[PDB]
Design a protein around this motif. Sequence first.
Motif, PDB file in Angstrom:
ATOM      1  N   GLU C 333      15.505  27.068  21.344  1.00 35.35           N
ATOM      2  CA  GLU C 333      15.849  27.307  19.943  1.00 35.35           C
ATOM      3  C   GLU C 333      16.892  28.409  19.804  1.00 35.35           C
ATOM      4  OE1 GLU C 333      14.820  24.855  18.678  1.00 35.35           O
ATOM      5  OE2 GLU C 333      12.851  24.404  19.506  1.00 35.35           O
ATOM      6  N   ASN C 334      16.645  29.566  20.410  1.00 32.39           N
ATOM      7  CA  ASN C 334      17.617  30.647  20.356  1.00 32.39           C
ATOM      8  C   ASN C 334      18.704  30.388  21.398  1.00 32.39           C
ATOM      9  OD1 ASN C 334      16.207  31.221  22.678  1.00 32.39           O
ATOM     10  ND2 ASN C 334      15.320  33.137  21.929  1.00 32.39           N
ATOM     11  N   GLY C 335      19.599  31.350  21.582  1.00 25.73           N
ATOM     12  CA  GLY C 335      20.714  31.151  22.485  1.00 25.73           C
ATOM     13  C   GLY C 335      20.457  31.610  23.903  1.00 25.73           C
TER      14      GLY C 335
ATOM     15  N   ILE G 135      18.210  28.103  11.801  1.00 29.32           N
ATOM     16  CA  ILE G 135      19.325  28.940  11.372  1.00 29.32           C
ATOM     17  C   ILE G 135      18.814  30.224  10.729  1.00 29.32           C
ATOM     18  CG2 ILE G 135      21.345  29.047   9.888  1.00 29.32           C
ATOM     19  CD1 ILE G 135      21.998  26.298  10.453  1.00 29.32           C
ATOM     20  N   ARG G 136      17.708  30.143   9.983  1.00 31.01           N
ATOM     21  CA  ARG G 136      17.120  31.342   9.401  1.00 31.01           C
ATOM     22  C   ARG G 136      16.625  32.293  10.481  1.00 31.01           C
ATOM     23  NH1 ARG G 136      13.637  29.667   4.972  1.00 31.01           N
ATOM     24  NH2 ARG G 136      12.682  28.408   6.630  1.00 31.01           N
ATOM     25  N   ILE G 191      31.808  18.233  15.375  1.00 27.52           N
ATOM     26  CA  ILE G 191      32.679  19.155  16.091  1.00 27.52           C
ATOM     27  C   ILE G 191      32.276  19.224  17.561  1.00 27.52           C
ATOM     28  CG2 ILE G 191      32.843  20.446  13.948  1.00 27.52           C
ATOM     29  CD1 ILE G 191      31.526  22.725  16.092  1.00 27.52           C
ATOM     30  N   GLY G 192      33.238  19.603  18.397  1.00 26.96           N
ATOM     31  CA  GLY G 192      32.989  19.726  19.818  1.00 26.96           C
ATOM     32  C   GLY G 192      32.848  18.419  20.559  1.00 26.96           C
ATOM     33  N   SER G 193      33.177  17.294  19.922  1.00 26.13           N
ATOM     34  CA  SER G 193      33.033  15.965  20.519  1.00 26.13           C
ATOM     35  C   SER G 193      31.601  15.733  20.997  1.00 26.13           C
ATOM     36  CB  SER G 193      34.035  15.760  21.659  1.00 26.13           C
ATOM     37  OG  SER G 193      33.672  16.514  22.802  1.00 26.13           O
ATOM     38  N   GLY G 194      30.649  15.941  20.092  1.00 25.52           N
ATOM     39  CA  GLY G 194      29.247  15.791  20.425  1.00 25.52           C
ATOM     40  C   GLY G 194      28.643  17.054  20.999  1.00 25.52           C
ATOM     41  N   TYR G 195      28.743  18.152  20.258  1.00 30.07           N
ATOM     42  CA  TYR G 195      28.219  19.442  20.683  1.00 30.07           C
ATOM     43  C   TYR G 195      26.881  19.690  20.002  1.00 30.07           C
ATOM     44  CZ  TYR G 195      27.456  24.461  19.998  1.00 30.07           C
ATOM     45  OH  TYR G 195      26.895  25.712  19.884  1.00 30.07           O
ATOM     46  N   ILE G 196      25.858  19.979  20.801  1.00 30.21           N
ATOM     47  CA  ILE G 196      24.490  20.137  20.324  1.00 30.21           C
ATOM     48  C   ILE G 196      24.005  21.525  20.713  1.00 30.21           C
ATOM     49  CG2 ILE G 196      22.143  19.289  20.473  1.00 30.21           C
ATOM     50  CD1 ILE G 196      23.371  16.528  21.179  1.00 30.21           C
ATOM     51  N   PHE G 197      23.439  22.251  19.748  1.00 27.84           N
ATOM     52  CA  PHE G 197      23.044  23.642  19.954  1.00 27.84           C
ATOM     53  C   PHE G 197      21.581  23.786  20.363  1.00 27.84           C
ATOM     54  CE2 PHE G 197      21.238  27.564  18.164  1.00 27.84           C
ATOM     55  CZ  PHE G 197      21.955  28.502  18.877  1.00 27.84           C
ATOM     56  N   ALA G 198      20.653  23.342  19.513  1.00 37.04           N
ATOM     57  CA  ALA G 198      19.236  23.529  19.812  1.00 37.04           C
ATOM     58  C   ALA G 198      18.755  22.574  20.894  1.00 37.04           C
ATOM     59  CB  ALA G 198      18.402  23.359  18.546  1.00 37.04           C
TER      60      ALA G 198
END
Lengths: 53, 98, 392, 96, 49, 88, 226
Positions: C333-335, G135-136, G191-198
């Motif tokens: 979840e975090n970075g 995000i919170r 964005i990022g051509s399929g960029y996933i963060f979590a």
Amino acid sequence: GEMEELETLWLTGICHNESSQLDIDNMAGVFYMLAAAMALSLITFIWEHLFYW
Amino acid sequence: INNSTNEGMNVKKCCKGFCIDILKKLSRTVKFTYDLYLVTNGKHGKKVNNVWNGMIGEVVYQRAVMAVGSLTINEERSEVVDFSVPFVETGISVMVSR
Amino acid sequence: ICTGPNDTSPGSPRHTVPQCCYGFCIDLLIKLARTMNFTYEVHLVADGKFGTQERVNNSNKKEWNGMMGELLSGQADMIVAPLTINNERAQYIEFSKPFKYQGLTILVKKEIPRSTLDSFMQPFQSTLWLLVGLSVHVVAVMLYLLDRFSPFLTLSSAMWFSWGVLLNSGIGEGAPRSFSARILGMVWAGFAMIIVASYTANLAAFLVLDRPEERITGINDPRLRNPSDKFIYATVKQSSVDIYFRRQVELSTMYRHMEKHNYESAAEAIQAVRDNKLHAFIWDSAVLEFEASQKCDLVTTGELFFRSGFGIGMRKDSPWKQNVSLSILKSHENGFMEDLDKTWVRYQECDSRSNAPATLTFENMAGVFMLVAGGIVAGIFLIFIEIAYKRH
Amino acid sequence: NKLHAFIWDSAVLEFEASQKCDLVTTGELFFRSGFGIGMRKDSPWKQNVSLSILKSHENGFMEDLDKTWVRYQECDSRSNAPATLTFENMAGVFML
Amino acid sequence: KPFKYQGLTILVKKEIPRSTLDSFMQPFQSTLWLLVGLSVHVVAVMLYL
Amino acid sequence: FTIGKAIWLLWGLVFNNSVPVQNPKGTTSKIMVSVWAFFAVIFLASYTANLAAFIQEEFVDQVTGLSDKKFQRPHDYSPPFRFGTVPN
Amino acid sequence: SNGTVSPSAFLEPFSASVWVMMFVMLLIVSAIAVFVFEYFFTIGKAIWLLWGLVFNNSVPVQNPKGTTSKIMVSVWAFFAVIFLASYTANLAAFIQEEFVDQVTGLSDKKFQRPHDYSPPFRFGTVPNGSTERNIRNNYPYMHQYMTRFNQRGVEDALVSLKTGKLDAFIYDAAVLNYKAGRDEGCKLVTIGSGYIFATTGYGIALQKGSPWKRQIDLALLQFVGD
Ligand SMILES: CC(C)CCC[C@@H](C)[C@H]1CC[C@H]2[C@@H]3CC=C4C[C@@H](OC(=O)CCC(=O)O)CC[C@]4(C)[C@H]3CC[C@]12C
Ligand SMILES: CC(C)CCC[C@@H](C)[C@H]1CC[C@H]2[C@@H]3CC=C4C[C@@H](OC(=O)CCC(=O)O)CC[C@]4(C)[C@H]3CC[C@]12C
Ligand SMILES: CC(C)CCC[C@@H](C)[C@H]1CC[C@H]2[C@@H]3CC=C4C[C@@H](OC(=O)CCC(=O)O)CC[C@]4(C)[C@H]3CC[C@]12C
Ligand SMILES: Cc1nc2nc(C3CC3)nn2c(O)c1NS(=O)(=O)c1ccc(C2CCCCC2)cc1
Ligand SMILES: Cc1nc2nc(C3CC3)nn2c(O)c1NS(=O)(=O)c1ccc(C2CCCCC2)cc1
Ligand SMILES: CCCCCCCCCCCC
Ligand SMILES: CCCCCCCCCCCC
């Protein structure tokens, strides 16, 4: 449509989905045109000689 | 076993393919049981000396109820045995080197 | 400090030497030991195998090798490594939530294109070059013949006109004056334009001989569907991809081909691909993509298949299952997983991957430079030849 | 242009495309089947009609029917080669 | 037995291409045409200068 | 500046190979030459754009069909046609 | 985005070293050779003639008188034909529209500190979701700015993006990928051509200690493997 699935599974091949050097035969028409030029040049040269005479 | 002897053995191999997938789907849909066995009597089916050999020959002489394979629907064969509706289209065609 | 076997070659004395380990999984393990208060000691697998159900010779007993044999026998308590999640492994051990999502892919040779000196003269065959060279002189001399013998342009002038019409240079200040000569010369101009356009049309393709042998589509390629002796592709023996190919219903035909070429470790297969002993290597997306980024001569193929994730496997009855899974999720979840990817996976050295047409460099076009040099060296003698001719 | 696309049998659509210059088929024939001379379930002509159809297939009768009814062409204009410039495509330069 | 083997397919409009008079001037927009036309004269006159 | 020289100049501009030409002296003739040279640029671009595809290898089938004269009467050929099928 | 084309796009057909050797190394040597051959017509005029031959636009040139100089000019014009062919062959592809993403990622300065921009960045997500919670938890200030532009649903966010009331939509990767695939005109892209963060996954929730969990996991893995 199960028949179609079986056909794609069992019968599909290499060439079904589907820059080269140029030979004399590849560009033979241009040389034919040049030969026609030679013939026409000779013919009109003879014609000019006949007209001069 | 060899050309010297006139008898052989029933080796249990495994048959799979387009016709086998058709046969398996047929077995599931019609709810029947099957015993496949390759034919060595004839090449593909032919009437020589008024005797049918091969796949058609085995079917006509009651040696097997069905003949599943690359069997082409013909005029004489349909006169001798009863065919099903065609499942793939074939015909005589010419293949040449490009 | 990880205690692992020293010599990985088969039939060698394998003594557990203490070496040192570091990387993505070690960093994740340190994070786990920090968040969850426990102490760890790392030790490599006895062999180089990830783990696969194999039938031992005696009594025909199912047995796990590599990591699964190490863990299920009690020798190890946790597996922090790229262990793919699948049924055969999950039936006996239990995996946490994936800490890295990836898939199977194919690594092949980059196959940089080979450029020759004659690349510029490739579009026309030698017979065509000889024919056009003869035709230029034939047209020039017969132009002279029809101009000198006109009813009402020296040899050098006619030759220069023909040559400068062929290749656009302007070396001909003199044009034919007789009508037949004008007609012939101008249709010859059209012919020269046609020759130049035909030679130009495919010149770029012949300058850089790019071929479709490289950039295999993937497993969907009918080359991969039907194995051949000339095209040899493999994977790592006794690994997750091997199990996936074994169990898959339809890819058995090429599994039979791959069974006789499987490699002991991923590094050996990558090296074999690098020196062209192996045409294609099937392995995890993360490792293969990292190697492709690091190694300029290796490239992946695309269309990731068998999408799965690496899991920190533990025994079925373990107390850390929920806590490890929760810690993996929280790090996701975090970075933290992003930081690990940036510091271990997402650094690049050479990519050279773009859909744009290739940019000409020295190697792709140097035959033209050597042709200009040959013109220099030929003129250096032709000047003396012309001086000697003028002497006579 | 009231209907963008019409789904129908390959034979009829291909014949119309050959006859009509402004209509074209799309390809990848699906639901491969055949036209049959249907009769009642309890009929005496079933075997004879089927045998006659097969016999006409074997010799050159269905080929003759295809040639005389289906396999004649008026305008095709179907080729993978690039289009040839004509009066309409390149005329602004003439007016220039 | 089938007397004609066939399949389902889709018939659509041929859609013959539409060609306009300005087709040759299409690759450059009007602003680019004006810019190059102005540039020609600018270069010429100050070459003279 | 005869008509023959004007034709020669305009033709040379059609496919500019730096052929020797005598340009007209008049300003309006020069403007006409310029617009024709623009037309020639158009012509050369449009012709060369697809020349590679048009000059490409075309594969022609040896025989049209089973009714071809090669199959029906193969004897009337210097190389006899070699065709056959498997028996039975 | 409407995109942009780099000014160097027309210089892409050849690398910088190739341009240098072609025009300042080989051309100068060829000019020296042409002038020497002719003298056996200054050097500036030879350079001018050779450069004019590089891209033959019928520029006024003075041809050399010597025969060997003419031969060198001829072979140089052949080289110039090669150069023009190779440069023009791929000029269409190199001069082509390039689409650059507005934001590199969630860590971009636009998301973190949107106030330092003349047009404020318009981004937000639907409420009562996992993305809002993430995000919170991660970015409080970004969340406090972004809740002002809070959307109502997926379709509301998409229509706001299309009209222009919203520039960025932060949502689940799978749903956004499906929307980008379904979108006509390819106007909306991730964005990022399929960029996933979590980079989480979709799971089937179950009661704690449910007996079905093991069998469901095994069956899901079977579906994945097969
Ligand atoms: C004015 C009279 C004497 C005619 C002069 C014609 C010539 C200009 C020659 C030069 C080259 C000749 C061409 C060279 C060879 C070709 C191949 C030739 O194709 C083949 O026979 C098989 C390929 C091969 O020849 O190897 C056809 C003629 C043709 C176009 C020739 C046509 C006549 C050409 C153009
Ligand atoms: C004959 C003399 C005058 C030398 C020949 C001129 C070129 C060699 C110079 C002049 C201008 C130069 C260009 C001017 C500025 C551009 C932008 C410049 O920065 C960018 O790429 C901006 C990208 C963006 O804003 O998206 C990069 C070089 C470049 C292509 C230059 C490339 C080399 C240029 C063409
Ligand atoms: C006096 C005679 C020898 C004429 C001198 C010509 C040079 C002044 C021009 C001609 C070509 C120019 C070059 C053409 C293009 C190259 C590539 C170019 O690198 C790029 O990729 C484009 C710029 C960028 O990407 O930012 C840099 C300039 C440069 C070296 C130019 C540098 C200046 C050049 C050599
Ligand atoms: C098969 C092959 N392999 C090569 N590897 C290399 C490299 C990189 C070092 N070059 N090269 C070749 O050039 C060939 N082909 S060749 O031997 O028939 C041949 C030789 C020489 C010339 C002249 C042509 C006019 C300009 C000067 C050179 C032309 C053709
Ligand atoms: C929208 C449109 N529809 C058209 N239908 C036709 C056809 C077939 C009959 N032409 N045509 C057009 O040409 C336009 N575009 S235009 O009205 O902006 C326009 C007009 C005139 C010129 C000049 C340019 C220099 C050469 C002379 C004509 C250029 C542009
Ligand atoms: C008086 C000059 C007449 C020039 C005629 C040229 C004809 C060229 C024909 C080219 C056909 C491709
Ligand atoms: C694209 C760069 C073009 C540079 C042209 C330089 C021309 C120099 C001519 C010198 C004549 C004396």
